[PDB]
Amino acid sequence: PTSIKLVVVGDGAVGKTCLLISYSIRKFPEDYIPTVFDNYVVSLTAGTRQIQLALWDTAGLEEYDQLRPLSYSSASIFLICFSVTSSVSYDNVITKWHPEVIHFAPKVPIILVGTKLDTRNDPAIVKRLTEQGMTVINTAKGEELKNRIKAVKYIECSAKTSENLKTVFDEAVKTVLM
Amino acid sequence: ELIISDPTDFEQITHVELGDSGLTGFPPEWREKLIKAGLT
Numbered sequence: 001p002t003s004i005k006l007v008v009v010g011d012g013a014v015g016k017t018c019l020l021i022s023y024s025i026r027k028f029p030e031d032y033i034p035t036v037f038d039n040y041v042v043s044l045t046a047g048t049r050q051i052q053l054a055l056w057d058t059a060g061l062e063e064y065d066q067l068r069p070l071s072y073s074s075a076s077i078f079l080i081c082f083s084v085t086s087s088v089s090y091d092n093v094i095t096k097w098h099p100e101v102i103h104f105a106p107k108v109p110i111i112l113v114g115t116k117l118d119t120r121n122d123p124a125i126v127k128r129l130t131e132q133g134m135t136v137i138n139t140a141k142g143e144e145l146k147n148r149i150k151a152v153k154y155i156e157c158s159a160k161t162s163e164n165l166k167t168v169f170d171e172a173v174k175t176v177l178m
Numbered sequence: 179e180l181i182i183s184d185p186t187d188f189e190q191i192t193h194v195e196l197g198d199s200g201l202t203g204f205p206p207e208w209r210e211k212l213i214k215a216g217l218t
């Protein structure tokens with residue numbers, strides 16, 4: 001059976017952990033507990049080929065900045081995540097996460113993931129963002145980031161509703177196996 | 179055109195959390211696992 005190593009990075013609370021857990025065991029955590037380090041494995045089939053998909057969850061908080069690279073060795077693929085309702089997290093993809101990733105694994109494919117899709121049409125959320133001079137990330141500005149950091153794909157999803165959730169991992173498995 | 183199944187056989191290999199008295203985690207040799215993981 002083939003081994004694939006997936007590593008997720010991105011700002012705190014963008015939803016990296018909920019993404020991994022919602023996908024792997026069909027449950028949405030709800031409580032927020034910041035990750036320090038967590039490693040999981042699931043079994044998949046891609047055609048007839050048996051697959052061990054290793055999921056390496058990392059800490060978004062900057063307290064763990066010097067520990068985070070322990071997760072980066074021999075990666076098959078990176079997911080870099082930002083929340084579509086956090087332009088701050090979008091910018092940090094540019095100033096921090098993309099630079100961090102390529103510094104350690106410049107040749108490893110990156111998929112850009114916009115998280116919390118379900119929040120973009122939440123009128124109450126848009127209020128918050130407007131009264132504070134922040135903005136929603138629309139799909140176009142998402143594809144723009146993808147092109148800017150030379151990410152292979154850009155996928156928007158919701159761990160809460162599961163909209164496009166499975167797609168994120170199918171595409172990652174495909175990018176690696178191709 | 180590969181058909182990717184949903185995942186099965188979920189297992190959590192390593193876990194680290196921040197306690198009031200430093201980091202703890204499982205399995206007991208988690209620190210060895212982290213450092214070995216960082217090695218290439």
Ligand SMILES: Nc1nc2c(ncn2[C@@H]2O[C@H](COP(=O)(O)OP(=O)(O)OP(=O)(O)O)[C@@H](O)[C@H]2O)c(=O)[nH]1
Pocket residue numbers: 010011012013014015016017018019029030031032033034035036058059060061115116117118119157158159160161
């Ligand atoms: N509405 C909505 N909320 C979400 C979604 N995914 C995560 N959240 C919420 O956002 C908070 C952060 O989720 P996490 O998955 O723990 O965030 P993280 O990126 O893993 O954070 P760190 O481990 O600290 O880096 C949690 O309370 C979730 O309930 C989503 O798809 N939709």
Ligand SMILES: [Mg+2]
Pocket residue numbers: 016017018033034035057058
């Ligand atoms: Mg987390």
Ligand SMILES: [Mg+2]
Pocket residue numbers: 062065
């Ligand atoms: Mg730092």
Ligand SMILES: [Mg+2]
Pocket residue numbers: 104105106107108
């Ligand atoms: Mg590399």
